Amino acid sequence: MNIVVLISGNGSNLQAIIDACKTNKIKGTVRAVFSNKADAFGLERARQAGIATHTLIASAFDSREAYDRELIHEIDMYAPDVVVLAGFMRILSPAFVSHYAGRLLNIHPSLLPKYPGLHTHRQALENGDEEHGTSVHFVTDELDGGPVILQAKVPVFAGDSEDDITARVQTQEHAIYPLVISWFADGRLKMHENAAWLDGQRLPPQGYA
Numbered sequence: 353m354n355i356v357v358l359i360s361g362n363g364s365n366l367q368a369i370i371d372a373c374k375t376n377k378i379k380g381t382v383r384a385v386f387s388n389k390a391d392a393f394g395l396e397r398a399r400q401a402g403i404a405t406h407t408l409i410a411s412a413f414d415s416r417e418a419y420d421r422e423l424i425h426e427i428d429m430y431a432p433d434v435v436v437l438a439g440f441m442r443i444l445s446p447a448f449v450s451h452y453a454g455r456l457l458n459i460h461p462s463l464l465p466k467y468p469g470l471h472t473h474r475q476a477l478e479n480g481d482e483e484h485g486t487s488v489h490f491v492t493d494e495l496d497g498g499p500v501i502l503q504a505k506v507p508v509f510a511g512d513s514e515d516d517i518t519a520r521v522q523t524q525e526h527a528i529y530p531l532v533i534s535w536f537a538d539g540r541l542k543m544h545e546n547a548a549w550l551d552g553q554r555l556p557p558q559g560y561a
């Protein structure tokens with residue numbers, strides 16, 4: 353099974369996917385890593401692991417719809433079974449999402465539906481929430497609002513800075529994202545429009561395993 357992952361930055365979630373694949377905890381392999389950022393450190397992590405690297409700068413493209421068609425064109429050389437967003441900072445257009453319908457996955461750092469945009473850790477901190485988290489979901493047109501597959505909650509404390517909530521949440525991501533990609537790789541996980549289905553069971557809105 354061919355996985356390609358899209359990144360915009362450090363690549364710590366990418367690294368976890370590579371390591372799980374390597375130890376066959378995921379029955380499948382990362383064929384290519386795409387970045388929209390030429391300085392993304394995740395590309396050096398891909399490179400050291402011997403995966404194909406591709407940077408595709410949108411300055412160059414004149415239109416959203418246009419950038420996304422070159423990106424579809426290049427991804428499909430690797431013939432992906434699943435494409436996974438892991439830190440990719442761009443809204444994907446209806447066409448992209450329509451093309452990878454059912455096999456497009458993302459990790460969002462909030463307990464969805466709660467903070468469906470950017471700055472979610474700072475929102476948790478400023479609203480004085482007890483509990484923060486992370487959510488793995490199927491990507492849909494609706495920004496950060498496709499069916500949730502698995503969340504992991506985290507405590508937010510008191511003398512807690514954004515960096516502390518951030519690193520605590522990232523720890524959970526590194527454990528639950530390889531795990532839902534292996535349920536996908538084993539044929540367990542499916543979307544049947546707007547619903548996520550694990551082992552034939554329609555999952556509830558907040559996910560769960």
Ligand SMILES: Nc1nc(=O)c2cc(CNc3ccc(C(=O)N[C@@H](CCC(=O)O)C(=O)O)cc3)cnc2[nH]1
Pocket residue numbers: 437440441442443444445446449458470491492493494495496497498
């Ligand atoms: N269609 C779609 N659905 C999704 O649920 C989705 C999930 C993530 C959502 N992640 C993010 C990450 C960064 C930005 C971001 O930088 N947004 C700015 C810049 C414009 C752009 O994203 O292309 C903005 O104006 O919101 C947006 C969403 C990636 N694209 C998706 N695209």
Ligand SMILES: NCC(=O)N[C@@H]1O[C@H](COP(=O)([O-])[O-])[C@@H](O)[C@H]1O
Pocket residue numbers: 361362363364365366438439440459460461522525
């Ligand atoms: N909705 C998009 C988004 O903000 N995603 C977040 O980007 C980070 C990338 O980490 P990494 O570069 O170390 O993998 C991840 O922590 C992920 O939750």
